[PDB]
Amino acid sequence: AIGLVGRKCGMTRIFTDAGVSVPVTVIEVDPNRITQIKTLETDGYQAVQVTTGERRESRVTNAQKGHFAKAGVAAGRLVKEFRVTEAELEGREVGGTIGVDLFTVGQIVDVTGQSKGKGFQGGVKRWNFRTQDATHGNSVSHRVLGSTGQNQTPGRVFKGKKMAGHLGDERVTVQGLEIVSVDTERSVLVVKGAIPGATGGDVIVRPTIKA
Amino acid sequence: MIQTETMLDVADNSGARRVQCIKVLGGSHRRYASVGDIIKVTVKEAIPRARVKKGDVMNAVVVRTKFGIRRPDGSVIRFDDNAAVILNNNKAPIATRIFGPVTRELRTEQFMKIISLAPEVL
Amino acid sequence: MRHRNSGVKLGRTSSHRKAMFENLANSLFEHELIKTTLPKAKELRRVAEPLITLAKNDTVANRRLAFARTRNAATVGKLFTVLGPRYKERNGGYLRVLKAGFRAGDAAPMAYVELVDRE
Amino acid sequence: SGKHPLVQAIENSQLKTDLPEFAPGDTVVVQVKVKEGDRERLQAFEGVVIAKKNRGLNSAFTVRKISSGVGVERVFQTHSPVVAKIEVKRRGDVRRAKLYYLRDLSGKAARIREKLP
Amino acid sequence: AVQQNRKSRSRRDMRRSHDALTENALTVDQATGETHRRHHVTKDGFYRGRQLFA
RNA sequence: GUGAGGGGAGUGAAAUAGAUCCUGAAACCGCAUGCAUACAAGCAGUGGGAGCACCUUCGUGGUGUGACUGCGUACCUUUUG
RNA sequence: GAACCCACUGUCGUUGAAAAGCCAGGGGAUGACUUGUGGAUAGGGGUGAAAGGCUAAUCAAGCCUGGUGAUAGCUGGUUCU
RNA sequence: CAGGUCGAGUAGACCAAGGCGCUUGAGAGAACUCUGCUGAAGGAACUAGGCAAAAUGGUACCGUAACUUCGGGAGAAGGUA
RNA sequence: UAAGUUCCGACCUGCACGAAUGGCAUAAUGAUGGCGGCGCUGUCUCCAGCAGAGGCUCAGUGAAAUCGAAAUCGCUGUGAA
RNA sequence: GUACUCUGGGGAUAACAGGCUGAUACCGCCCAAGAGUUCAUAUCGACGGCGGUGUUUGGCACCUCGAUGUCGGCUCAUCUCAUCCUGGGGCUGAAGCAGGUCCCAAGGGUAUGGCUGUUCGCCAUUUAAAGAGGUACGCGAGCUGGGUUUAGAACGUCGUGAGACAGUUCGGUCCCUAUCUACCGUGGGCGCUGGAAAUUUGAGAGGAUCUGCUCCUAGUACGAGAGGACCAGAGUGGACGAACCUCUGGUGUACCGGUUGUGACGCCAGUCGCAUCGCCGGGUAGCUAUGUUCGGAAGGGAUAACCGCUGAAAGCAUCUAAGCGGGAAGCCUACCUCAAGAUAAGAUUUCCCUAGGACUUUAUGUCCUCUAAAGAGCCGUUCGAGACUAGGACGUUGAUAGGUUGGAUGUGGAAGCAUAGUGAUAUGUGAAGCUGACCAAUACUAAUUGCUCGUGAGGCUUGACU
């Protein structure tokens, strides 16, 4: 559905009048500008393309400059698409603006981001493998994988075997988060719970898909 | 945060003085028991001439822990000891007095007796 | 991982590293122009510049702090009588680091460290 | 103030403005709201402040006391609405910020000497 | 652990197909006219007009 | 680099006879030219076979390469094998 | 309980720094003690608070040279048409 | 042969006289390996086995069981400054 | 012990103890074999962070065992099985 | 006699694992004396008979003795279904709750301890459940080495003895830097019908799939009573997984302080070196679990056993032969991630290049002169990105890094001076001084003048529009 592109600003807490402390994440939103509308007749699917942020002209290439000039909007730091249906598509025109008023307090949303990168990691951290005994005669085999297969039959290692490798720095979606505050004066969304990625990262907020 | 082999004080006068946890109840592979959970204990030390004797295997409910408990506003309450109260086969208290403070996580129909007898409540 | 961490190692213990950087700072304050490796030169800024910032104000306590950090009476005297008055009106940036090729013995990258207004 | 200005503003919107001044070593009485069903009451908690954390809206402080021969510690969140009132009964004189050494002392050993004007 | 068969010259050269060297970034210094390594002081002590040695 | 090594000049019938110097094979390692080779599975050949490059008595010719294709699991010993 | 003489446990090392070690602990330490120099015992012999231990990194009979090209109903190999 | 401050000491820490920085370096600060330090709550549930680690540790004084070959056990255990 | 194929006490149908190839005990002693406690702990539940040495990158020097030849995939079947 | 041993040979010949076979083992079926108040077939089932599998004990001696080197434990698994739990059903000697037996079903799940070297077994306490098997009785170039099976020693027993064992007991060296296949990650090259910057469709692949208890329906249906529901709704847990660091904590050897010994800075005072960061008490960022939040929801389509509607063959009957339905944690979708090297190489928006000669091999022809775009890279300042790479931001028209200024935090009363004390010390100046990695400003220092690559309108044939 139609959503918003924002930037993660950090975590804090909100106190309710009953005294409950609610952990929250703050998302700063610069209003998204519509750059292109895609239709069945010319593209074969329905989507809305948006841009947000700022980018200097020396870093904007000529092709992108023409693409933005056609829509009549200022160049942003990124471009994104949202798949839409007819009803959501109604009301939107190239050059329009989508703001934080798209959401309401109490609404359930999904948040997508890029998780933190841990680099090259081993079995213990990456797959929750168990270590071998620290004492009792162990020989340089504390955090190693162990066995990786059977004997002559089948005489190989199967695909998908859990091994060491790169961990983190992936696209991750968290579902079922609740909108706690919608600050229109500051263009801010305050959601309950944690969201993927580091401070300053780009995030996507969409209405929940589970019902 | 009570597991097996953990020793606990007895915050009552049913006769036991020290008990040892031998099982955490309520699920397969369940590791820890906190305030308000049911455990199986063996009696290690008891006052002579009392209903409970050494080597008894009974049920108990945890009432105080050193690890603590979290509250909705974000606070934590920690005690200086780990303590428990003995129950019968129907999981009901059998003691007639209680020693020391306790927590609000016991406000269930199963556990009014301990609070009603307890002197100090915070 | 080393997310957002500061400081270098350079294959030395902590006390050895601290002593080495103190020696480098003393040599720089004496000669006003030195040649060293590039990582050492870049790390030397964070140790040398605050000494000038401190020496801008001449008090007994400041002199004793400078002596605690340098252990060189001549360095303390030159800092408080020459370099601080020279850089009294400059907002940081008293050193300049310039790449100077590689070293014959081990192909290590090298750099020049210079005071801003040397002569 | 190690956060972004937006977060700073959001937290500053909720700060309490009538805290008293207190330091580790002082003995305080805290009134805590207890809210069962639709009965609401204030319950007292009196003890020695052994730790203080100054982090704006994230400020906390730890109070220790002895209750019928059992020691109890509670970490209050300073700006929480459940904390109704803080009253400083007596000012103590100590030489450090965290008084964790008081956990191993009991009775006469854990006395705090008074700050005099 | 060791090879069961000797490796052929073709496979050896195929492995070495990634060993080529690369040129440095060189630039003509405008102040003195000499070729120097980019972003580096020249051999005689010149960089962006300023001179290091008297 | 008053180095090692080489390029000229000169000697000699001969210096690719120049000092661990007659002749200078093979394993092994380079540079150059021609053709093939980055959608395709295996003892690497064999029987067919298009295209290309050079030569040419211009050809039903010679030399190099070999897209595509049928068949095809090394040698010796010891063994019933 | 140091020096000195040993070698009970563990990690490491195993194409080792080392053809028997390092590190952290361990035992004896005025005695049936440790050690320098110079001598004696020689191979079916010596010596042994005794393990078939030691006798030049070699021991259920040392090393070297001869008999000697020992013998092998066994294994391998055996060259042009 | 072998000094100074503490010390019973030729133990130990830091120094003197006197010697050295051990014949590849510079960066980086992933998995995994080696050597160390700290660790919430639990405290042998580990394991063939408390293996390894953790813990005890000085001087003076008080006190100290069974058993005994009357010597011991014994620095028993435990405690104060 | 909550739970004891090990341990301790006793019983005796001793497969197949027994008196200088000594029998039954025994204070002290043992880097001796078995069992149980206190203290203590990363042995473990279940691992986390940090420091040094390698690993990785650059410059210099520069090994090893192995090796019929290789244009060296999966599965089911066949076949010195 | 040799376990103190040695040489020449054999997979011509044994022990382990493989192979053939299937007596034995396990599983299934046929007949049915009978048991079951009567009633062979609810559930058992004698005497006999026929098969399946390749988990047992065996038979053979085909592979390996110029070596295929392991009983159990640990770590990590993968498949089967003859199903342990959860799901759907038929019968019942099925009132209800439960139970018995058979059919369908492999998506997920499927204990901790005491004893022993154990596998196994017994025992204690749990759980919805603690299934049976194959994979060299899976896994030792991944760990261990307690048992067995070298050399020492002892007991019982046998032998005259050297010595030995349907036995027991104490002690006793586990090597290998990974070439190829496989697997987990991460790059370079070329291709994709002129080149380039972005945004994308999804052929397809992987991940996930579990379940307890309480309330309610309702003390209702059922029942003499005791007991006590189907269907349909809420809530709250266990285990597992992911992301995160606001909260609670751990670490935090470049942050602050206390303190012992020694040496030095001429001395006092004040400091520094070394002693595991000398020891001790705290602690900012970052990382992190034991902390916080979230997930396995709901819905479609085709089906398994099973239950049907109408309906003849066969005037009746009959779920089937024509025709039309219902039906499961299982299948395809659905949720998350990857995905056009998908050589079938896809799509959309925008941007760039519109010069002359010579010749012959007259062709997207080869050589000269001019031209060098859109962009990419080299280089530099660097990063919450990282082994090297790759990826992200910036390079003066600049906040990319360091420094500087301000703030915040931590520690806890700096030095000097002055007072009160004989003195150790205490108080004031003053919550002072110092404060890695954090927040905000600021061109002071460093990101210079640059170079290389990438071209000059993009073959032909047919068709439809112009």
Side-chain angles (χ1 to χ4, degrees):
Chain A
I2 189 47
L4 278 177
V5 184
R7 180 154 58 192
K8 176 183 191 175
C9 204
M11 287 219 48
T12 177
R13 85 216 293 188
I14 300 287
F15 280 112
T16 73
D17 41 2
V20 176
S21 177
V22 183
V24 296
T25 311
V26 174
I27 304 184
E28 169 245 301
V29 172
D30 169 60
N32 294 191
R33 316 181 280 276
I34 296 164
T35 49
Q36 193 182 351
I37 306 273
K38 293 195 176 171
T39 75
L40 296 158
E41 37 280 17
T42 176
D43 305 275
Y45 69 98
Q46 297 154 100
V48 177
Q49 196 192 70
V50 302
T51 198
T52 190
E54 205 32 89
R55 197 86 191 271
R56 65 186 85 239
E57 89 97 33
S58 106
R59 292 284 172 182
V60 181
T61 73
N62 207 235
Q64 291 310 109
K65 156 166 192 256
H67 180 71
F68 290 126
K70 185 188 185 180
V73 302
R77 81 170 171 269
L78 70 99
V79 185
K80 267 278 316 193
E81 273 189 29
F82 293 98
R83 289 282 284 277
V84 295
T85 196
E86 226 86 71
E88 328 190 39
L89 195 33
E90 175 274 20
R92 313 291 180 183
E93 292 86 86
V94 151
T97 289
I98 317 191
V100 298
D101 50 272
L102 180 66
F103 296 107
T104 55
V105 173
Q107 184 174 1
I108 311 290
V109 296
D110 309 18
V111 183
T112 308
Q114 201 84 14
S115 66
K116 288 180 155 174
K118 318 291 177 89
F120 202 124
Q121 288 298 338
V124 168
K125 191 189 174 88
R126 179 174 190 221
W127 301 111
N128 303 313
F129 281 3
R130 297 184 270 252
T131 66
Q132 299 181 51
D133 51 1
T135 69
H136 291 288
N138 188 288
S139 265
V140 302
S141 298
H142 307 293
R143 302 173 73 94
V144 299
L145 296 178
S147 179
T148 58
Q150 292 87 45
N151 206 316
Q152 161 154 205
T153 295
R156 74 199 166 98
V157 176
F158 286 123
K159 277 210 211 251
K161 178 80 190 66
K162 292 175 180 182
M163 308 206 130
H166 186 216
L167 168 67
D169 198 22
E170 286 150 316
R171 171 190 168 106
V172 178
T173 294
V174 180
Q175 304 174 325
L177 301 183
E178 199 221 341
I179 298 285
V180 177
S181 183
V182 174
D183 215 296
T184 54
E185 268 71 89
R186 306 222 194 70
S187 188
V188 157
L189 295 169
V190 178
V191 314
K192 178 202 199 206
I195 74 177
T199 297
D202 285 341
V203 293
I204 316 296
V205 183
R206 285 172 301 155
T208 185
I209 191 57
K210 304 290 184 73
Chain B
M1 222 188 155
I2 313 296
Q3 64 181 254
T4 36
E5 312 283 319
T6 300
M7 296 285 288
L8 298 98
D9 283 351
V10 183
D12 80 61
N13 57 340
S14 48
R17 318 209 73 52
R18 304 234 69 201
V19 289
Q20 185 178 243
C21 171
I22 66 167
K23 189 76 54 174
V24 177
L25 300 175
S28 172
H29 277 132
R30 182 181 186 153
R31 291 182 187 94
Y32 309 119
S34 174
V35 173
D37 300 349
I38 312 290
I39 57 175
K40 210 67 170 206
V41 302
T42 176
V43 168
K44 294 303 204 179
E45 162 89 13
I47 178 65
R49 305 181 301 269
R51 252 163 302 98
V52 193
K53 322 203 181 63
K54 302 166 55 293
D56 284 325
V57 174
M58 332 195 60
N59 300 302
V61 59
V62 178
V63 302
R64 287 195 298 265
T65 60
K66 273 167 122 313
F67 187 76
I69 48 151
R70 307 290 301 273
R71 280 267 204 273
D73 79 315
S75 34
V76 58
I77 297 152
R78 303 185 286 259
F79 292 98
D80 270 11
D81 67 314
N82 307 310
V85 170
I86 307 269
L87 318 161
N88 58 36
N89 259 352
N90 294 281
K91 324 271 208 243
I94 64 164
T96 86
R97 286 181 58 181
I98 296 300
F99 295 105
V102 285
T103 75
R104 308 318 63 69
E105 294 55 31
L106 289 189
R107 297 304 47 61
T108 88
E109 196 53 59
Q110 186 171 12
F111 299 129
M112 288 338 148
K113 189 142 175 280
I114 319 193
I115 281 281
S116 29
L117 293 166
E120 203 298 90
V121 170
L122 319 169
Chain C
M1 298 164 278
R2 53 148 297 281
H3 293 167
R4 326 261 282 162
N5 290 349
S6 276
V8 306
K9 292 185 186 267
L10 306 180
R12 284 168 174 83
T13 63
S14 313
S15 48
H16 183 1
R17 193 168 56 244
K18 191 174 83 113
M20 181 193 67
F21 277 113
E22 260 145 44
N23 279 332
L24 267 169
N26 282 329
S27 308
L28 173 69
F29 288 144
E30 202 218 305
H31 296 293
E32 262 152 283
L33 169 67
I34 58 164
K35 215 202 165 177
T36 192
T37 69
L38 180 61
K40 287 184 190 75
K42 286 193 157 156
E43 175 61 38
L44 177 62
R45 291 169 307 163
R46 305 188 60 228
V47 172
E49 281 199 47
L51 287 165
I52 290 155
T53 307
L54 170 70
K56 286 183 181 203
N57 291 107
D58 192 2
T59 69
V60 169
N62 286 338
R63 290 208 182 212
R64 290 174 178 203
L65 286 179
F67 186 70
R69 269 138 209 201
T70 60
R71 299 304 289 190
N72 200 284
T75 293
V76 169
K78 186 171 190 187
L79 278 167
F80 277 85
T81 63
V82 179
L83 297 181
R86 182 198 290 176
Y87 298 127
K88 174 52 105 140
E89 301 298 345
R90 190 176 282 264
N91 295 328
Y94 324 109
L95 321 194
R96 79 163 38 97
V97 178
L98 309 168
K99 262 86 68 196
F102 57 79
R103 179 158 74 181
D106 48 16
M110 311 288 295
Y112 282 126
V113 185
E114 202 203 359
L115 295 200
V116 149
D117 287 336
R118 170 164 56 107
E119 46 110 347
Chain D
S1 320
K3 316 286 163 63
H4 287 171
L6 267 179
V7 172
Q8 282 165 27
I10 281 160
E11 316 188 317
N12 289 335
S13 172
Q14 330 178 220
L15 293 169
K16 284 190 195 159
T17 48
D18 63 320
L19 277 314
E21 319 265 46
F22 62 98
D26 309 7
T27 159
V28 307
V29 179
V30 187
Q31 304 293 337
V32 179
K33 260 126 100 163
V34 181
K35 178 47 226 77
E36 298 146 356
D38 46 326
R39 290 66 56 230
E40 207 300 274
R41 60 181 274 235
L42 298 182
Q43 177 195 30
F45 192 106
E46 175 176 323
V48 188
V49 170
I50 65 158
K52 227 200 155 186
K53 163 197 185 189
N54 307 277
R55 221 60 50 88
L57 184 76
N58 288 302
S59 298
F61 66 102
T62 309
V63 181
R64 179 183 171 80
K65 88 172 162 136
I66 310 269
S67 163
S68 92
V70 164
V72 47
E73 275 155 51
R74 177 148 183 174
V75 185
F76 293 100
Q77 313 286 301
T78 316
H79 297 281
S80 180
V82 309
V83 169
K85 192 167 163 273
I86 311 166
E87 188 299 278
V88 181
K89 263 182 32 38
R90 153 193 153 49
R91 255 107 182 151
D93 179 331
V94 288
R95 284 303 290 283
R96 60 196 64 253
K98 307 283 196 285
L99 308 179
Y100 303 130
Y101 70 90
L102 287 171
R103 302 173 167 155
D104 315 282
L105 296 179
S106 169
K108 319 306 197 58
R111 54 184 67 265
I112 285 319
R113 179 248 289 131
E114 182 167 351
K115 199 196 275 287
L116 71 92
Chain E
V2 71
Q3 73 196 2
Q4 285 199 358
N5 289 103
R6 66 187 283 165
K7 189 182 280 295
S8 66
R9 51 176 66 87
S10 158
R11 308 297 320 189
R12 172 198 75 208
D13 299 336
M14 275 184 200
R15 175 181 67 241
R16 294 174 184 177
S17 84
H18 291 281
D19 280 354
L21 302 179
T22 278
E23 280 170 64
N24 296 107
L26 308 184
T27 278
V28 189
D29 179 301
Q30 210 33 27
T32 51
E34 53 197 317
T35 300
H36 76 117
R37 170 142 28 201
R38 190 160 144 86
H39 289 109
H40 288 222
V41 181
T42 77
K43 319 272 212 201
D44 53 339
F46 296 79
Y47 191 74
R48 283 153 111 260
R50 172 201 334 280
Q51 160 143 225
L52 284 184
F53 313 120

